[PDB]
Design an enzyme around this catalytic site. Sequence first.
Site, PDB file in Angstrom:
ATOM      1  N   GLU B  12       7.528   3.733  -7.265  1.00  0.00           N
ATOM      2  CA  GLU B  12       7.439   2.284  -7.108  1.00  0.00           C
ATOM      3  C   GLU B  12       6.282   1.790  -8.020  1.00  0.00           C
ATOM      4  OE1 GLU B  12       5.098  -0.097  -6.562  1.00  0.00           O
ATOM      5  OE2 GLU B  12       6.685  -1.600  -6.832  1.00  0.00           O
ATOM      6  N   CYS B  59       4.398  -4.801  -1.379  1.00  0.00           N
ATOM      7  CA  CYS B  59       5.432  -3.813  -1.575  1.00  0.00           C
ATOM      8  C   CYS B  59       6.700  -3.954  -0.748  1.00  0.00           C
ATOM      9  CB  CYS B  59       4.796  -2.458  -1.268  1.00  0.00           C
ATOM     10  SG  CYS B  59       5.909  -1.166  -1.839  1.00  0.00           S
ATOM     11  N   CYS B  62       7.838   0.107   1.060  1.00  0.00           N
ATOM     12  CA  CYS B  62       7.159   0.264   2.347  1.00  0.00           C
ATOM     13  C   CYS B  62       6.987  -1.180   2.905  1.00  0.00           C
ATOM     14  CB  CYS B  62       5.847   0.987   2.265  1.00  0.00           C
ATOM     15  SG  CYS B  62       4.530   0.160   1.359  1.00  0.00           S
ATOM     16  N   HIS B  66       2.819  -3.686   5.897  1.00  0.00           N
ATOM     17  CA  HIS B  66       1.769  -4.655   5.572  1.00  0.00           C
ATOM     18  C   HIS B  66       1.915  -5.867   6.492  1.00  0.00           C
ATOM     19  CE1 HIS B  66       0.134  -2.815   2.061  1.00  0.00           C
ATOM     20  NE2 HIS B  66       1.386  -2.565   1.731  1.00  0.00           N
ATOM     21  N   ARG B 457       3.275   6.494   3.591  1.00  0.00           N
ATOM     22  CA  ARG B 457       2.442   7.144   2.585  1.00  0.00           C
ATOM     23  C   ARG B 457       1.006   7.419   2.952  1.00  0.00           C
ATOM     24  NH1 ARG B 457       6.402   4.478   1.028  1.00  0.00           N
ATOM     25  NH2 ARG B 457       7.824   5.190  -0.645  1.00  0.00           N
ATOM     26  N   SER B 480      -1.758   4.665  -1.230  1.00  0.00           N
ATOM     27  CA  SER B 480      -1.677   5.074  -2.647  1.00  0.00           C
ATOM     28  C   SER B 480      -2.972   4.741  -3.341  1.00  0.00           C
ATOM     29  CB  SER B 480      -0.489   4.506  -3.387  1.00  0.00           C
ATOM     30  OG  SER B 480       0.735   4.996  -2.839  1.00  0.00           O
ATOM     31  N   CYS B 524       3.061   4.628  -4.849  1.00  0.00           N
ATOM     32  CA  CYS B 524       3.502   3.236  -4.689  1.00  0.00           C
ATOM     33  C   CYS B 524       2.407   2.433  -5.398  1.00  0.00           C
ATOM     34  CB  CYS B 524       3.681   2.778  -3.286  1.00  0.00           C
ATOM     35  SG  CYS B 524       4.665   1.260  -3.325  1.00  0.00           S
ATOM     36  N   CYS B 527       1.598  -1.222  -3.957  1.00  0.00           N
ATOM     37  CA  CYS B 527       0.772  -1.075  -2.799  1.00  0.00           C
ATOM     38  C   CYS B 527      -0.634  -0.648  -3.247  1.00  0.00           C
ATOM     39  CB  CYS B 527       1.130   0.071  -1.889  1.00  0.00           C
ATOM     40  SG  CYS B 527       2.318  -0.183  -0.634  1.00  0.00           S
TER      41      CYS B 527
HETATM   42  N1  FCO Z   1       3.751   3.447   2.495  1.00  0.00           N
HETATM   43  C1  FCO Z   1       3.388   2.529   1.886  1.00  0.00           C
HETATM   44 FE1  FCO Z   1       2.810   1.444   0.760  1.00  0.00          FE
HETATM   45  C2  FCO Z   1       1.617   2.657  -0.006  1.00  0.00           C
HETATM   46  N2  FCO Z   1       0.869   3.398  -0.587  1.00  0.00           N
HETATM   47  C3  FCO Z   1       1.343   1.058   1.855  1.00  0.00           C
HETATM   48  O1  FCO Z   1       0.963   0.857   2.945  1.00  0.00           O
HETATM   49 NI    NI Z   2       4.772   0.541  -1.176  1.00  0.00          NI
HETATM   50  O   LIG Z   3       4.568   2.025  -0.304  1.00  0.00           O
END
Ligand code: FCO
Ligand code: NI
Ligand SMILES: [O]
Lengths: 261, 530
Positions: B12, B59, B62, B66, B457, B480, B524, B527
């Site tokens: 991503e 993102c 995922c 958030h 993640r 990430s 990601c 993110c």
């Molecule tokens: N899983 C996800 Fe996205 C990432 N790194 C965040 O929280």
């Molecule tokens: Ni993400």
């Molecule tokens: O993510």
Amino acid sequence: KKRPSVVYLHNAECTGCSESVLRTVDPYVDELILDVISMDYHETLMAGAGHAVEEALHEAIKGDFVCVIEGGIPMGDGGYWGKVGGRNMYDICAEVAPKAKAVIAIGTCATYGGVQAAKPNPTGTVGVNEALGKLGVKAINIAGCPPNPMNFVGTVVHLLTKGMPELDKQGRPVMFFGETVHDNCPRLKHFEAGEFATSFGSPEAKKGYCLYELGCKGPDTYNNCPKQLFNQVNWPVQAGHPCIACSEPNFWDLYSPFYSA
Amino acid sequence: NKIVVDPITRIEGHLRIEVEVEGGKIKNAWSMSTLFRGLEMILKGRDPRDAQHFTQRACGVCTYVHALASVRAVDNCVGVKIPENATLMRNLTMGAQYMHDHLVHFYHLHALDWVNVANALNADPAKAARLANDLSPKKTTTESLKAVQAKVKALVESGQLGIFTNAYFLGGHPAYVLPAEVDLIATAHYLEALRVQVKAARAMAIFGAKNPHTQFTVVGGCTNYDSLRPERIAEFRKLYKEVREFIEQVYITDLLAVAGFYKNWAGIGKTSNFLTCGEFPTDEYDLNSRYTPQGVIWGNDLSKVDDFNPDLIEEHVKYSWYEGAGAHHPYKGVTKPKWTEFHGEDRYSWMKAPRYKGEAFEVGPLASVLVAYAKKHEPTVKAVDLVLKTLGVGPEALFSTLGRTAARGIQCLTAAQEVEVWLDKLEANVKAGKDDLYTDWQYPTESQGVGFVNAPRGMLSHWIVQRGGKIENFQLVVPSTWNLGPRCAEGKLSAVEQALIGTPIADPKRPVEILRTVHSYDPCIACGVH
Ligand code: FCO
Ligand code: NI
Ligand SMILES: [O]
Ligand code: SF4
Ligand code: SF4
Ligand code: F3S
Ligand SMILES: [Mg+2]
């Protein structure tokens, strides 16, 4: 060769526009990718990486293709905020987009600027037609954050079967964005009856009354959410959350604060 | 000499990897995140009730996580106690997000670094079906396998390879060693996972309104009274079982099978220092009421699991494109982007560098699973054993790229096992007439709050500082950002950079060994930088 060629570009995005795509049903993404079109360039699904993929994008653009752009294009201070390969996103798009037979802007970010374009727009992001309009790009805008899988795939297939869809002044295909969410909302019965929820934990909320007072932007949003559903199963208002006007230009600023009419 | 991979595909966002090779082995590495959107700058001065809608867009892979960390950070800073049903419903939606996320990562994002799809064409379908049948309880037929082979042939024969154009396994590759028969079972499963992922997403949409980007959460609870109906719980329950079965019978079994031909990867891409905040609380104000536990492993010592202390987090900018070289705790975070070009002043990333008590850490399924396992979480402990037992290796095999990959399989099943529990409760509460989803709240004059989420993640935390129902500060510290950020001021290598060092590269012109390592982390970039 056989199937029409598609080159899919990722700019200032969250990638929720590509995951919406994978959700398509009749046709499923496998039927799409193996029988309807040729997905020649798509960063998210590609087998090779680095220069193997850039050589692919490079040869695909020598032919007859449709260009799919996801994400807004960063343009402040020169656009170095968004890079692929060391090249600014605006440079890649300026090169690719104009050679396509049609350009499709997917997601409110590609169409109008999106989330990164909300105030104060640190990166100077803009939508496709605002950035490339002067290179002659006139993209079809599939709005939403993300759009219904149906509206993007149904436009690709339309484009491939019947030709260019009629657009509204906002660039969206009238066949999908011609009526407001409110006009098809099932809580319209409550609305018409003068029955409104003024709080999320109240008996009216539990009874599924209209969310207008709770900031539903439904009367102002053009989309087909109520009639098509999402995941073949639900939509925001059915899950008792008001519509945030996610398919409209500048919703982020124009329609927030979200929980107030 | 250097090897640069840009773009890294099957992730991503925008990532660029640059490595230094010496004697066929990675000797140095730099993780370069190349897109900045600036979500924390946009939040400044807005209504905390809007945060969740903006943050969710950090993102779309995922998706939801958030929205949750944001509503948890504002719930916390306003002191609200959401009802039990909103807690259960928020947990089911996250469970469904792990189910989906993990499955899509394994098959569409990662499989292609271990599987030569072209070789599948060389498999004997009857011999592939027999093997498949010796691996799981789900009956496979030759014909279904012969059919996938005809699909691949039909595609290759058109000359439009699409997403296989220039694949690294084209015409063989020394790092790709599975038998053609395993390559065909895996190809038949990849197409199959494309259809299961549709069901996992639909299940999530039963509670979430839609997928991607849910719209059913608020500060104070949830809004979905419609889904509290027996019909809608039955619906969810049916899709849930179809997906659960597929993870248990196809994803897990395929995972152990492929891992079985790449046991040398159990010694490649090793790390120390793991952390998690746990997920799935009963008490939204107690990290210890969470199903999967919280904890901190130092080095690779599973005998001593410390307590997770968020006061120990600082984000660095010494090698990122932000002003100066200060590290700040998130409540005191600053986001002043200052571009200096690739390696301009040695800065090489749009990602900040989170350090824990000044050390570099790894977050994610491996970290989560190591904490749970060390703390003796039965589900986890029964699952780790199955795996080691199946690969005939010990737990020391878990500290590697192979381990990082089997742990995602483990985290995906434990989550899956618990969805049944929350459903059941949700349902009993509604049967008893207990149907509340929301709690009223008011803003304090000035307050600060933190939302801890263990996303697919790893460790996610949203930090807010409000005054008058207006955001003064909103900082996101994403998993990430931990795994893939640049070095800190003390010049320590982030977990991905460190995992890279020592990796052997067969063909530098097609360096899939870097992808195997980078992908095991499920990067990601959207993110990590926001
Ligand atoms: N899983 C996800 Fe996205 C990432 N790194 C965040 O929280
Ligand atoms: Ni993400
Ligand atoms: O993510
Ligand atoms: S339109 Fe929304 S879902 Fe699509 S890329 Fe932009 S933020 Fe993500
Ligand atoms: S809930 Fe929203 S879209 Fe539906 S009737 Fe009320 S204002 Fe209109
Ligand atoms: S928020 Fe977007 S998804 Fe449809 S209900 Fe409103 S236009
Ligand atoms: Mg941040």
